Amino acid sequence: STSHCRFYENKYPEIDDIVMVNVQQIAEMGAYVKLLEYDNIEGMILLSELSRSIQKLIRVGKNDVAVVLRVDKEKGYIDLSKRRVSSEDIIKCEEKYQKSKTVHSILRYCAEEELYKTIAWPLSRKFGHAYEAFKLSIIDETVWEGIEPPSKDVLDELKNYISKR
Amino acid sequence: TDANLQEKKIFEEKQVSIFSHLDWRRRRTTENIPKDIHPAVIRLGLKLANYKIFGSNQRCIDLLKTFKIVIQDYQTPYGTTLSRHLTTHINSQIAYLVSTRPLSISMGNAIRFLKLEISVLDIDLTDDEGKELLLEKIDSYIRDRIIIAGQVIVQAATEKIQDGDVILTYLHSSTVNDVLIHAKNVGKKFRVVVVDSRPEFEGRVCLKLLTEHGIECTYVMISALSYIMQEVTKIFLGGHAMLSNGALYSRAGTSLISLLGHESNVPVIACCESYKFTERIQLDSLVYNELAPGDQLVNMGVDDFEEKPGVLANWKSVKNLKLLSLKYDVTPPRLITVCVCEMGLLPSTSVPAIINEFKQVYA
Amino acid sequence: GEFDIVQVYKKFLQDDPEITMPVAAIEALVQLLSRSQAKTISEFMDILQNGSNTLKEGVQNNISLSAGCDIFQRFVTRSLHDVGDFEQCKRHLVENGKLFIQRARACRQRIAHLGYPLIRDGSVILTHGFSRGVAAVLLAAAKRHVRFKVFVTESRPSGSGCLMTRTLKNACIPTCMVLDSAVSFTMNRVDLVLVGAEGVVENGGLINQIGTFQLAVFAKHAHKPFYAVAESHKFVRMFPLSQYDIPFSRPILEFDDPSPETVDAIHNELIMNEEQIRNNPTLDVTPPEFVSGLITDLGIIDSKSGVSEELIKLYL
Amino acid sequence: SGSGCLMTRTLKNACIPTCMVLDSAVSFTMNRVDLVLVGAEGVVENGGLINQIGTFQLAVFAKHAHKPFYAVAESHKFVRMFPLSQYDIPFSRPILEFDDPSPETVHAIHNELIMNEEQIRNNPTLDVTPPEFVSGLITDLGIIDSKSGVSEELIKLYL
């Protein structure tokens, strides 16, 4: 359906990627977390990563950035880590995030899911990103390649909606 | 200060009276203040001597938030770098502040901490590099040491609250109020007892807060403790400090609460924060303490500001007669059941180890 | 896939009855761990908890294992890391499992050759009900050829006293079973009291069988010392407030509502019925001021504040 | 004695709520009580109490749990005996003796492994509550808390 949807065409992230994740509940040995970039799917962080055996840190609803370790796509289990991220990436993710987040808030205009499959990801395939070279929608016309029609109404919202918000 | 022959005068203040040593000297006005005093420090110094209900936590916060402004407005005498000279400037701020009200434990430990980070600071930095750093360290201090610890204690505190309890507090502890209000917001079914005492009835404001959240509250002065304790089933105390022996150091009436509670078999719970622990110890509530002017109880009656005089207005000039009112007293540890630090629920006797966890595995 | 680990737990009790219930649980988890073939770290900890809780709720939510189960989890959770080979995880994991079982099995021994000198020549000891702990130390003392005598509380409703005396009588030890109502009268004779343990708390408290604190105050009042033997895997993370604040499954000590409409100096067999009994509680709690020394594989601990430092050391 | 069940019914028979408590777990109940009341089988000079075994077992709790302790005694139960400690009382049979285990080999509601009648006999049937634990002693002569007037009224009895 088109209530909540994905961000990047890879349904899962690869090993050694960097992903923003919002913490939820902490168990006796792990930290059940939801990676919001992929429709808030769940993952787990071993009780071995801090962020300066620190009992005080009981975070609930805080977005954090981590790195994937192992992935089992058939059972959905994911293992992540935190104390292994570097400098730029730890904010490059955030830098990469909100732009990607911004695009998601655009598509829920009538979806409060498929336009990624139609437009966004193939565009993200070309310029490595949607935001990156998104401004070309006013200073170039390479954005016309292989555009697929939805229906009559929301047929052309691109030239109706570029520089905004 | 004529000199420190006035400190020799203190050496003469060791006479028959048990309170001979207790320092009475204060400065509650800005008359003849020195030049090297920051304005935002003055306001605090005024807030110290004249405010009541000045929670031991807020003071540490308001001190640090003020301290940043001092350093941010500080500029070293160039040619002499920052670290070599910053302390004496700050050391000249404390010496002023103490003359308005002696340092709480919640403040002194922060002082001994910042003075440390000044020395350990890397010299290879510059001013705008250095001062910006410890500001975050100060902010980090406020984040980790108090607010979070506060946010952790309350959660662990209300955890052991049971539906149908009867809670007893005494003289407005911002932390104790902070956990009580949380208990109502999670639907805990209970009611509160509020004990107050002379002079400045600090308990009324605790009644004001709790009532403005709609809690079955009960207000009785301490000289009714024998009566009301039968209704009570649990006791919560927020302390000024906890001693390395395990004793609890809080406002003057804290002890009788714990005492009457024990002899009535109710538990005593000390919600205190780690940074208010002290390596020192006390056997009597008189060796280390601080006073309030005895005039404040001359006003008999239910008000404090209101000009209702008394029969003792001349006590200053009536020999063999003196009024006093200590503000704090210790409380032996065998009466405290649990202490609620951000390290969890601990027995009060386990305090000094926690202090070592700071001294050790850090620097 | 066993899918019925409780049986392995159960089977351990028949392959050896001389092991404590939590020991079998850990010994069963390893069998689950060793046979479990996963691919994510989360997979282990997921079924591990879902195995422990599965093991927990099966045994009336007993406390002894509930500690050991949780401690064991938080043990392997410590020095856990995943570098390169995923199989290293299980390697470091299950290898520490047996290593923990090693200490666990040797724990009940380590206290023996540590608490036996607490018995002196011709001394007289008191014990509330059977406990595997107090048994061995006495035997490991009586083995050393030392004269002493021992009373044993009958320990209603458990009645474990009738078995405790036999285990001592069989091991060449003079006994004298005593009613639960006559312990105070016995303190005059006793030189030292000693009981086992079913659970040690954050404050140094002592969750053991129903009547421990009953005689803990006596020794405290009769000025005789108090000692309790407790294995490491009996430390719990709870924290009561008195001699009462404990979660208990069945509601206890209810009353009846009598509507106005109804109907030898040793009178044996005139007691309460089984229905009357279970209304009464089962466990007890002696605050740490009444115990003078815990006996653990970690050694003898008397502060009952360092127990927390040790308890914090046990958990993460 | 097992006399609790008899006491239980006789109360329940008079429409008042009851709840039997095994002698091993009185302490756990004290925090719930507001008053403790026991009978008297005998009263000595010093204010002590001779009642069925376990009577002192309670009064120490009431003391430590800061709950009051009252005992009902009829005047004609006073006695001239004066035990020193809480133990020195004349007793018929030998009490609380041990065995002699020569080297041979003879061999949670477990409700049937109980001490036999023989080993039960080895237990005592009476304990003694020192006067420091009797907050109040009620008699036909009235209520006596002094535990010295216990003796003055006592002397007034033995002519």
UniProtKB/Swiss-Prot annotation, chain A:
Modified positions (Phosphoserine) in chain numbering: S51
Keyword Phosphoprotein: yes or no? yes
All copies of the S1 motif domain together span 16-83
One GO term under biological process is: translational initiation
Q: What result is annotated for mutating K82A? A: Alters the binding mode to the eIF2B complex
- Localization, UniProt: Cytoplasm, Cytosol
Name of the gene this protein is made from: SUI2
Q: Which organism is it from?
A: Saccharomyces cerevisiae (strain ATCC 204508 / S288c) (Baker's yeast)
Which family does this protein fall into? Belongs to the eIF-2-alpha family.
Q: What are the GO MF terms of this UniProt record?
A: ribosome binding; RNA binding; translation initiation factor activity
Protein name, as recorded: Eukaryotic translation initiation factor 2 subunit alpha
> Which UniProt keywords are listed?
Cytoplasm, Initiation factor, Phosphoprotein, Protein biosynthesis, RNA-binding
Q: State which residue ranges cross the membrane.
A: none
- What's the PTM story here? Phosphorylated; phosphorylation on Ser-51 by the GCN2 protein kinase occurs in response to low amino acid, carbon, or purine availability. Phosphorylation inhibits the guanine nucleotide exchange factor activity of the eIF2B complex.
* Keyword Protein biosynthesis annotated: yes
Assembly mode:
Eukaryotic translation initiation factor 2 eIF2 is a heterotrimeric complex composed of an alpha, a beta and a gamma subunit. The factors eIF-1, eIF-2, eIF-3, TIF5/eIF-5 and methionyl-tRNAi form a multifactor complex (MFC) that may bind to the 40S ribosome. Interacts with CDC123; the interaction is direct. Interacts with GCD1.
Give the misc comment.
Answer: Present with 17100 molecules/cell in log phase SD medium.
Curated annotation (Swiss-Prot), chain B:
Example of a GO cellular component annotation carried by this entry: eukaryotic translation initiation factor 2B complex
Q: Cytoplasm: is it a keyword of this entry?
A: yes
* Alphabetical keyword list: Cytoplasm, Initiation factor, Phosphoprotein, Protein biosynthesis
- Location relative to the cell: Cytoplasm, Cytosol
Q: Which domain of life is it from?
A: Eukaryota
Key word Nucleotide-binding present in the record? no
> What molecular function terms (GO) are annotated for this protein?
guanyl-nucleotide exchange factor activity; translation initiation factor activity
Annotated GO biological process:
cytoplasmic translational initiation
Major location category of this protein:
cytoplasm
Q: Which family does it belong to?
A: Belongs to the eIF-2B alpha/beta/delta subunits family.
Q: What does this protein do?
A: Acts as a component of the translation initiation factor 2B (eIF2B) complex, which catalyzes the exchange of GDP for GTP on the eukaryotic initiation factor 2 (eIF2) complex gamma subunit. Its guanine nucleotide exchange factor activity is repressed when bound to eIF2 complex phosphorylated on the alpha subunit, thereby limiting the amount of methionyl-initiator methionine tRNA available to the ribosome and consequently global translation is repressed.
The entry describes its oligomerization and partners as: Component of the translation initiation factor 2B (eIF2B) complex which is a heterodecamer of two sets of five different subunits: alpha, beta, gamma, delta and epsilon. Subunits alpha, beta and delta comprise a regulatory subcomplex and subunits epsilon and gamma comprise a catalytic subcomplex. Within the complex, the hexameric regulatory complex resides at the center, with the two heterodimeric catalytic subcomplexes bound on opposite sides.
The protein's name is Translation initiation factor eIF2B subunit delta
**What organism does the UniProt record list as the source?**
Schizosaccharomyces pombe (strain 972 / ATCC 24843) (Fission yeast)
Q: Note the residue range shown relative to the complete protein.
A: 105 to 467 of 467
Curated annotation (Swiss-Prot), chain D:
Please state where this protein is localized. Cytoplasm, Cytosol
Question: Which key words tag this protein in UniProt?
Answer: Cytoplasm, Initiation factor, Protein biosynthesis
Question: What superkingdom does the record give?
Answer: Eukaryota
One GO location term (cellular component): cytosol
GO biological process terms on file: cytoplasmic translational initiation; negative regulation of TORC1 signaling; translational initiation
Q: Which GO terms describe its molecular function?
A: guanyl-nucleotide exchange factor activity; translation initiation factor activity
The entry's family comment says: Belongs to the eIF-2B alpha/beta/delta subunits family.
Entry function = Acts as a component of the translation initiation factor 2B (eIF2B) complex, which catalyzes the exchange of GDP for GTP on the eukaryotic initiation factor 2 (eIF2) complex gamma subunit. Its guanine nucleotide exchange factor activity is repressed when bound to eIF2 complex phosphorylated on the alpha subunit, thereby limiting the amount of methionyl-initiator methionine tRNA available to the ribosome and consequently global translation is repressed.
Subunit relationships = Component of the translation initiation factor 2B (eIF2B) complex which is a heterodecamer of two sets of five different subunits: alpha, beta, gamma, delta and epsilon. Subunits alpha, beta and delta comprise a regulatory subcomplex and subunits epsilon and gamma comprise a catalytic subcomplex. Within the complex, the hexameric regulatory complex resides at the center, with the two heterodimeric catalytic subcomplexes bound on opposite sides.
Identification of the protein by name = Translation initiation factor eIF2B subunit alpha
Q: What is the lineage of its organism?
A: Eukaryota, Fungi, Dikarya, Ascomycota, Taphrinomycotina
Identify the gene encoding this protein.
gcn3
